[PDB]
Curated annotation (Swiss-Prot):
It comes from Rattus norvegicus (Rat). Disulfide bonds: none annotated. This is [Pyruvate dehydrogenase [acetyl-transferring]]-phosphatase 1, mitochondrial. Its cofactor is Mn(2+); Mg(2+). Binds 2 Mn(2+) ions per subunit. Binds 2 Mg(2+) ions per subunit. Mn(2+) can substitute Mg2(+) for catalytic activity. Residues 30-369 form the PPM-type phosphatase domain. It comes from the Eukaryota. It is an enzyme of class 3 (hydrolase). The gene is Pdp1.
Length: 382
């Protein structure tokens, strides 16, 4: 945990992806992205994921801040994008996909060799998903609404999976670990010039905008869900009786315990007392709890149309934002990419080196846009 040891961790977790510039006439509004992570906890609790939709034009990128363990953050890391993917899929594909089980490409991951996929849950997670697309097949797509549904579906699927557990003892223990741990989620969906950010928690998305003079401007694409968010404090007090205004949030924490006011997992703040107690009798592993449903995983979605002036997007957990002001981040990234960080290797690594040179896991994804392509898209609007 000395500078050297930290350096070695950075190189070891460093990831970089460049979009296939190929002249066959390609559309990527993304030049590529960089990502890195610094652990502060034994198994780090933060996760990072990135993927291109094989059936849909877009690309999915996200960061996940776990707590009370890595179980939930690991799970949502590898499951959420599939629920989002399926959720954006048209009826015919859903069809040929179901009618395909009784197998086709949905997503293509861009994963560091270090990150992984759950071992024994591929069957379970798969069926969970199947059931979801079957429901969609039961019944024009709005990306914002697809994100909210995809998010809420996975959280609800995690809850009942914990309730039915699978006989294998390991599998049963895993669905519980996942459901009793928690995780933040800040996802960006990029389809051409359309940028959607779905946020759940205190991780955050920031757009790097370069002014006509060359100076850098940061524009927030997500609101952190915590005590520092008065609209979130008003929403919490409103979701419960008036007598509870004095206890929903006690110290700046939800019910006096949780910092993030939205998250996946953490079912200790969602389930009824009896549901909790009963489930608890299987597998040897809150204050003013009056009107039980207190935490949601439902994201806040914001839309942004990319323009030539928008150079990059940085997704990161609060591990980053607790060390630097929002504009310094953008300034630092902007100059690095602009090659002026020396005036007077990997963008994610560079930034984390600034954030550190710490008291929480730090994960960052820096996405760089192709201003020529983005400009191209714009010229065929206007
Ligand atoms: Mg965490
Ligand atoms: Mg954190």
């Amino acid at each position: 945990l000395t500078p050297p040891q930290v350096n070695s961790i950075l190189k070891a977790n460093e990831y970089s992806f460049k979009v296939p510039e190929f002249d066959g006439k390609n559309v990527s509004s993304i030049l590529g992205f960089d990502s890195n992570r610094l652990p502060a906890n034994a198994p780090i609790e933060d996760r990072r994921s990135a993927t291109t939709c094989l059936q849909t034009r877009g690309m999915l990128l996200g960061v996940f801040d776990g707590h009370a363990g890595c179980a939930c953050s690991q799970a949502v890391s590898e499951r959420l994008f599939y629920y989002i993917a399926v959720s954006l899929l048209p009826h015919e594909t859903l069809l040929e996909i179901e009618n395909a089980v009784e197998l086709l490409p949905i997503l293509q991951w861009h994963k560091h060799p270090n990150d992984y996929f759950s071992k024994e849950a591929s069957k379970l997670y798969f069926n969970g998903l199947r059931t979801y697309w079957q429901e969609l097949i039961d019944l024009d797509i709005d990306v914002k609404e697809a994100l909210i549904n995809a998010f809420k579906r996975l959280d609800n699927d995690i809850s009942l999976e914990a309730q039915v557990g699978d006989p294998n003892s390991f599998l049963n223990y895993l669905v519980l670990r996942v459901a009793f741990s928690g995780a933040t989620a800040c996802v960006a969906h990029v389809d051409g010039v359309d940028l959607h950010v779905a946020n759940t928690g205190d991780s955050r998305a920031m757009l790097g905008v370069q002014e006509e003079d060359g100076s850098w401007s940061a524009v927030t694409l997500s609101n952190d869900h915590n005590a520092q968010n008065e609209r979130e404090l008003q929403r919490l007090k409103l979701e419960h009786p008036k007598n509870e205004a004095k206890s929903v949030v006690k110290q700046d924490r939800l019910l006096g315990l949780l910092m993030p006011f939205r998250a996946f997992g953490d079912v200790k703040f969602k389930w009824s007392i009896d549901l909790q107690k009963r489930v608890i009798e299987s597998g040897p592993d809150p204050p003013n709890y009056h009107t039980p449903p207190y935490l949601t995983a439902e994201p806040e979605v914001t839309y942004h149309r990319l323009r030539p002036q928008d150079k990059f997007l940085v997704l990161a957990t609060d591990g980053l934002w607790e060390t630097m002001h929002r504009q310094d981040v953008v300034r630092i990234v902007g100059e690095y990419l602009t090659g002026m960080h020396h005036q007077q290797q990997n963008a994610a690594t560079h930034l984390i080196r600034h954030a550190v040179g710490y008291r929480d896991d730090i994960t960052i994804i820096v996405v760089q846009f192709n201003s020529h392509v983005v400009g191209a898209y714009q010229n065929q609007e206007q």
